[PDB]
């Protein structure tokens, strides 16, 4: 391919490849896969793509784009890197370069959850207008495609529509403004929008690359934090004050929507397992809820600094 | 195939040419001093290479037709017009403030729906213009377009984007008025100036005529093509059923809607099929009752390239008159006749050019072009109507 | 078809400089001495008189295929071919040095205002074309095969990887077709090299234009020097396309391939190229050569070409009672019954010798020449009689002799 578009600011590489297909009139998806990649057995993935390294080679003449830059800034890697650990993070970075989609997903937690959560395409009414006003195009953006939240960080709600990634597994689709929006009222919960605005700065932060505390670091950090809050009995959890605080911070409808509904009667729970010794890396969203319920005076980067220090 | 010149941006002095990477990276607009000194060329004529053998002195004298060029009055106007229509065709195609991304987005629908008037944006206009060049055969339509378009770098590479701007492209029409062989010469000339494979993937997939008319004009916008030149547009006279008008409708939809400038070249036999037009004519000896200054300069600059040992520096009025009489104004005939006379003089051994020698060379070695020159000599419109292309 | 390993030479012309293609070719012989390598004669026509009657008769019929006498018109043609082969290589210089850095330095200097003007890469102009037109029987193919034989066909270069095919000779099709003269190119590049091309590039899906743009890549992949198309008269009045679908085909073909093109044809084919200024300009690109039969006398004195062509042919006789010196009446009879055409000179001599050998009267006489001409050479009678009359339109009834 003799002319590969540079990704716009804060874009998914899937949209870059789709726009590369648009700019040359390659309607046939097989022809697009042949030209861009060279093999017809690739999967168009949104969030944690593979085969980067032949994408970063098309942009090789542009000095400022390398493999790490696409891995960190134009794929949803910063939402898994701080939590998984060190060796898993390094292995995943090494495997994004090569042609293995399966191994990359296996190394990461919910990437190995083998379910494409809300695989349908999302978009935000107001963001598309701004992008049309400034860039002149409309592209998929990392803010919309949060792992579990169907919500834009700044505006209210993400207006869904039909079609999905898995309907055609070998085709890249690029948004056209002719489907700009449909005017129908939608209101969003305040605390969920607050969570989106709290987790958004983790995407655009250089310090998220090298701050990945280990498992024992996570469990010791949470243990000392719970001791400092004073709700901790001797080697035990109160299991009541924490639930009360998280219920005050986030309502029941929210916990239903993000699929973390509390079961205080059940001994095994997403909140209960954090206090005990950590066995596997928990998702970013559970940690976000814990942080926002316990102490709101520190940002995500400050929390990562405190966790990495000791 | 073509050398990729890395771009460096200058400071243009025009308000409209404000921040375009495409037209702020072209070579600076030259002036009247550089409109008549960046085209001139001549043979070296070293005095050390005049005393050599006959074979060396006869092989080094045949390079005159290829290496000699003298800019006339018309070339200044042609250069200025091409400069204007190649610099003004990018202002409506700004890649910075989202204007080229609005011309490429529309062109995907035309590939999909097959109709070349399905706009998706209405705020993306076109700012290209058109030119038409018509002149007698041998006037210099190609060799004075390969030295006026040769001051531009063709393939440029801008690294702020990833775009590889192709400044100008040249193709020529099919031997008949073919339909799928004008949209294939474009690909065959674009992928030998980039080292790519566009013909093997646009056309080999069994496309229709409409899809190959849309894909051509989409890939001509993926690379910011500045000027498209089509040589010998008279080949569309012998077109297929409807080809003589469908392509001339496309050539007015490309400059008006898609926005790529286009320039057309053809012999006066191509005026029947019809665009600002420029008409070229052979040099006339008399302009206002006195010999033409351009003709005098052309002759007196050609006369200073002579490998004959017994050469005459002074050019006789009789010799000039018989040269014009046997040439009838066409520059190709002028240069070719001079070279042939010089070769025959070297062959005989008499190394001074004479009017009789000129006439003998003409009569013996210009047999096919005889009736056209005689028709132009007679100047009767009835005789001119058949052949001589005037 | 045999690869000759390149051996580089230096020439005195400055425009050629260091060009592998020009410098690997044989050196620049002067045109005067270029007509001393064409000459040949029948080897060992001596001491064979007392051999037999049948061997001495099979050893005469090789006179037409082993005798060549250069004339005055074989200097100009040889010089034009020598200029045309090497002048078409100066543009194609493969051993380019550092061009990227020089061009970029020029671009930066002109963009910063230091250098006022600069010239970037240029495109080579149209290829030189020559048209040779002569009446049939004058030697338009023997001359080419004895002039191009001094140039090795396929030369192999060691530092490069190109098998420089110095020349190529193809012939036109009898249909007048235009896809059968773009395919003789591959079928004649297969008999010079070893690889096959008609299997790959000779399909039926490819049109005439595509077959004209794939005979341009393999025309500079091997640095081909000349393209000779023989018997161009066959293209008039063909059922494939009109008269303006080929007058444009030549223009396009000349404008694409870039290798010099030589066209050999008959005075009937002049009317094809004298139709418009474009085709006559391109066809007479490097002069138009017109060939005529030898005249017995020029101005008021006997010609010195006919005498030199006759008195040397007379020294290949194998009759026992050979005449020592040639007589004026015999020469005049030979000219009157020959009219200057080459094939009605050597053949009229060989046939007369065979007749004199068969009859047993071992002597060549005027009556024997007249008898053999009236008996065996019947089909050549009308056009020779028209030449005797000399009336142009009477000759124009026949379609291959000069009019
Ligand atoms: N102004 C000029 N000064 C010097 N030489 C010239 C000039 N114009 C043309 N020539 C000579 O004329 C030769 C042939 O002319 P050219 O190739 O430009 O013709 P053309 O316009 O392409 O003709 P056609 O009608 O066949 O398309 C060139 O090789 C060049 O040497
Ligand atoms: N200069 C010459 N000297 C001797 N014989 C010649 C000469 N030119 C032609 N011939 C004879 O003419 C015969 C026919 O020539 P040919 O190659 O058929 O020319 P064409 O194809 O133009 O008729 C040849 O056999 C050759 O012997
Ligand atoms: Mg031309
Ligand atoms: Mg022949
Ligand atoms: Zn938004």
Instruction: Evaluate whether chains C and A are touching (3 or more beta carbon pairs less than 8 Å apart).
Output: no
A176 touches chain B (CB under 8 A): yes
Burial readout C113-137 (b: 16 or more C-beta within 10 A, e: otherwise):
eeeeebebeeeeebbbbbbbbbbbb
Please, what sign has the CA dihedral across residues B107, B111, B112, B114? positive
Q: What is the DSSP letter of C40?
A: B
Q: Are 3 or more Cβ–Cβ pairs between B and C shorter than 8 Å?
A: yes
Q: Which residues of C202-223 are buried (b: 16+ CB within 10 A; e: fewer)?
A: beeeebbbbbbbbbbebbeebb
d(CA A18, CA A138): 11
Helix axes A241-249, A284-294, angle to 10 degrees: 100
Q: Report how many Cβ contacts below 8 Å link chain B to chain C.
A: 166
Determination approach: cryo-EM
Q: Which residue is listed with tokens 């091997």?
A: C222
- Give the angle subtended at the CA of C128 by the CAs of B355 and B383, to the nearest 5°: 55
Q: How far is it, in rounded angstroms, from Cα A121 to Cα B231?
A: 49
Q: Which residues in chain A have Cβ-Cβ distances shorter than 8 Å to B218?
A: 24-25
Burial of A251 (0-12, 13-18, 19+ CB in 10 A): middle
The answer to whether C151 touches C85, Cβ cutoff 8 Å, is: yes
Could A62 and B164 be called an inter-chain contact, meaning their C-beta atoms sit closer than 8 Å? no
Measured by CA distance, the residue closest to atom 18 of ligand 1 is: B140
Q: Which residue has the tokens 């775009």?
A: B163
Interacting residues of C239 by C-beta distance below 8 A, sequence separation 6+: C175, C176
Q: State both tokens at A202.
A: 């983790």
Q: In B94-120, which positions are buried (b, 16+ CB within 10 angstroms) versus exposed (e)? A: bbeebbbbbbbbbbbbbbeeeebeeee
Nearest to B142 by CA among B230, B236, B80: B230
Three-state DSSP class for residue B170: strand
Torsion angle (degrees, nearest 10) of CA C275, C281, C286, C288: 20
Which amino acid residue places its CA nearest to atom 19 of ligand 2?
Answer: C139
> Across the interface, which of B174, B365, B371 has its CB nearest the CB of C288?
B365
Q: Is C34 annotated as a binding residue?
A: no
- Nearest CA, atom 23, ligand 2: C137
Q: How far apart are CA A222 and CA B252, in angstroms?
A: 72
Residues B232-246: b if buried by 16+ CB within 10 A, e if exposed = bbbbbbbbeeebeeb
Geometric angle at alpha carbon A145, from A143 and A149, rounded to 5°: 90
β-partners of residue C134 are C291
Query: What's the rounded Cα separation, in Å, for the pair B83 and B284?
Result: 28
Cα–Cα nearest to B123, from B102, B105, B95:
B102
Phi, psi (degrees; rounded to nearest 5) at B369: -95, 10
SS3 B23: coil
Q: Which residue of B has its CA nearest to C29?
A: B55
State how far the Cα of A211 lies from the Cα of A219, in Å rounded to an integer.
16
Ligand 1 binding site (Cβ under 6 Å of any ligand atom): B 65, 68-70, 72, 137-144, 267, 331-332, 335; C 125-126, 278, 281
To the question of whether residue C138 is assigned a binding role by annotation, the answer is yes
Q: Are A137 and A190 in contact (CB under 8 A)?
A: no
Q: DSSP 3-state assignment of B227?
A: strand
The verdict on whether residue B47 carries a ligand-binding annotation is no
């Amino acid at each position: 391919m003799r002319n590969f578009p540079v990704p716009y600011s804060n874009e998914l590489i899937y949209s870059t490849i789709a726009r590369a297909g648009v700019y040359q009139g390659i309607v046939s998806p097989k022809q697009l896969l042949d030209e861009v990649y060279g093999n017809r057995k690739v999967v168009a993935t949104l969030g944690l793509p593979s085969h980067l390294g032949v994408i970063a080679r098309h942009l090789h003449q542009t000095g400022r784009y390398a493999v790490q830059q696409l891995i960190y800034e134009h794929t949803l890697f910063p939402l898994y890197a701080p939590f998984v650990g060190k060796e898993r993070r390094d292995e995943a970075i090494r495997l994004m370069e090569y042609q293995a989609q399966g191994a990359v997903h296996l190394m990461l937690g919910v990437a190995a959850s083998r379910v494409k959560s809300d695989n349908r395409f999302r978009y935000c009414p107001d963001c598309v207008a701004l992008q049309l006003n400034r860039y002149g195009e409309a592209f998929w953006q990392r803010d919309w495609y949060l792992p579990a939240l169907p919500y834009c960080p700044k505006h209210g709600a993400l207006v869904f529509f039909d079609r999905a990634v898995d309907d055609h597994r070998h085709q890249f689709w690029a948004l056209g403004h002719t489907e700009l929006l449909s005017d129908y009222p939608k209101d969003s919960l305040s605390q969920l929008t607050a969570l989106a605005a709290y987790i958004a700065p983790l995407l655009d932060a250089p310090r998220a690359q090298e701050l990945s505390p280990s498992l024992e670091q996570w469990t010791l950090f949470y243990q000392r934090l719970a001791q400092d809050l004073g709700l901790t009995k001797s080697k035990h959890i109160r299991h009541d004050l924490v639930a009360e605080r998280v219920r005050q911070t986030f309502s029941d409808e929210a916990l239903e929507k993000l699929d973390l509904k509390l079961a205080e009667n059940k001994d095994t729970c997403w909140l209960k397992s954090i206090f005990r010794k950590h066995r596997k890396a928990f998702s970013y969203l559970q940690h976000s809820i814990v942080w926002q319920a316990l102490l709101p005076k520190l940002t995500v980067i400050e929390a990562l600094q405190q966790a990495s220090a000791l | 195939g073509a050398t990729r010149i890395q771009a460096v941006y200058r400071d243009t002095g025009v308000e409209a040419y404000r921040d375009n990477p495409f037209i702020e990276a072209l070579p600076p607009l030259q002036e009247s001093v550089n409109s008549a000194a960046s085209l001139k060329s001549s043979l070296q004529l070293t005095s050390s290479d005049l005393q050599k053998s006959r074979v060396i002195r006869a092989h080094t004298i045949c390079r005159i037709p290829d290496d000699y060029f003298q800019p006339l009055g018309t070339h200044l106007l042609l250069s200025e017009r091409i400069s204007v229509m190649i610099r003004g065709g990018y202002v409506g195609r700004n890649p910075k403030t989202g204007d080229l991304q609005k011309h490429l987005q529309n062109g995907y629908e035309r590939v999909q729906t097959g109709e070349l008037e399905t706009f998706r944006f209405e705020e993306a206009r076109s700012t290209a213009q058109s030119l038409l060049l018509i002149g007698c055969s041998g006037s210099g339509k190609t060799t004075s377009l390969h030295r006026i378009l040769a001051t531009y770098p063709q393939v440029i590479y801008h690294r702020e984007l990833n775009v590889e701007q192709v400044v100008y492209l040249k193709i020529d029409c099919s031997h008949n008025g073919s339909l799928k062989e004008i949209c294939l010469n474009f690909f065959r000339a674009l992928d030998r100036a980039l080292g790519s494979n566009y013909e093997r993937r646009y056309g080999l997939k069994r496309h229709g005529i409409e899809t190959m008319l849309a894909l051509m004009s989409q890939i001509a916008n993926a690379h910011a093509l500045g000027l498209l030149v089509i040589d010998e547009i008279q080949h569309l006279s012998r077109s297929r059923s409807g080809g003589s008008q469908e392509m001339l409708n496309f050539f007015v939809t490309m400059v008006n809607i898609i926005g790529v400038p286009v320039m057309l070249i053809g012999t006066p036999k191509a005026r029947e099929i019809f665009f600002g037009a420029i008409f070229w004519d052979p040099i006339q000896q008399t302009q206002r009752g006195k010999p033409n200054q351009e003709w005098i300069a052309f002759t007196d600059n050609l006369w200073q390239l002579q490998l004959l040992q017994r050469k005459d520096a002074l050019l006789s009025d009789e010799v000039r008159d018989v040269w014009y009489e046997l040439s009838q104004g066409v520059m190709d005939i002028v240069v070719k006749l001079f070279v042939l006379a010089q070769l025959r003089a070297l062959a005989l051994g008499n190394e001074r050019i004479t009017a009789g020698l000129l006439r003998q060379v003409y009569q013996d070695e210009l047999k096919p072009v005889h009736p056209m020159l005689e028709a132009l000599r007679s100047g009767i419109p009835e005789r001119i109507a058949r052949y001589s292309d005037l």
